[PDB]
Design a protein around this ligand. Structure first.
Ligand SMILES: CN(CCC(=O)O)c1ccc([N+](=O)[O-])c2nonc12
Length: 132
């Protein structure tokens, strides 16, 4: 199940992140900085509680959750959302809902790399992380 996702990951490729942020309404100055930032994502577990940290020189976030149990979240761009994370087809699928809108954050493992696919509206972004 989740164990192969655990650890420290560093961003090594990003496609269409500006399009995704624009779709969400993120302002230009935040997008400019975020486009050059290379976050570290740390995924830890304690029993069935997962913690996902995203660290950078700009934004820092942390969420803790049980798989399959909804939780409140405030995103890096300050959306207040209702979230759930689950394991679907071997992928870690994070769904965020607010104001009747949705976005998905899907994490898969491919050849040892962590591929994060972000979808909102028509915008589809792919970020690739490598394990530290
Ligand atoms: C979804 N992510 C996380 C990306 C990742 O973890 O690589 C985001 C990370 C950072 C910002 N931001 O506005 O600074 C975001 N705005 O929308 N999404 C944002």
């Amino acid at each position: 199940m989740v164990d192969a996702f655990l650890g420290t990951w560093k961003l090594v490729d990003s496609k269409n992140f500006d399009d995704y942020m624009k779709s969400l309404g993120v302002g230009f100055a935040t997008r400019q900085v975020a486009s050059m930032t290379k976050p570290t994502t740390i995924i830890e577990k304690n029993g069935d509680i997962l913690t996902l940290k995203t660290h950078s020189t700009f934004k820092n976030t942390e969420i803790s959750f049980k798989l399959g149990v909804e939780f409140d979240e405030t995103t890096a761009d300050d959306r207040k959302v209702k979230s759930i994370v689950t394991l679907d087809g071997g992928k870690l699928v994070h769904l965020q809902k607010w104001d009747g809108q949705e976005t998905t954050l899907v994490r898969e493992l491919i050849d040892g790399k962590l591929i994060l696919t972000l979808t909102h509206g028509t915008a589809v972004c792919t970020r690739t992380y490598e394990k530290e």
